[PDB]
């Protein structure tokens, strides 16, 4: 059986939302200097 907890998956849902925002943040950082 699985050794992954509901708590483990809850961390990951939040860490994923964080990650996708981080990808857009990096794209903005790149553009700020582009001009």
């Amino acid at each position: 059986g699985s050794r992954v907890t509901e708590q483990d998956k809850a961390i990951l849902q939040l860490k994923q939302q964080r990650d996708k925002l981080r990808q857009y943040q990096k794209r903005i950082a790149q553009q700020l200097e582009r001009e």
Binding site: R3, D8, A10, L12, D19, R22, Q23
Partner: protein, 75 residues
Amino acid sequence: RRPEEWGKLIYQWVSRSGQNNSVFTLYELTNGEDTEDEEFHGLDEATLLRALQALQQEHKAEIITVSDGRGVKFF
């Protein structure tokens, strides 16, 4: 290199030092801050998953594939 070798390198990093977390998104392993200087940073998702699958086969990892929170737990 090989996926199993990539596996060996990733698992080495999770153990040596960065030991607070057991649960990682796939993204943060390859594009995060804590792993920025590691040999597997920038590694493509496809090859990363095959690395993780070899780990999972040895019980060193369990992959989480649900879209609402994808990632991996190391053991």
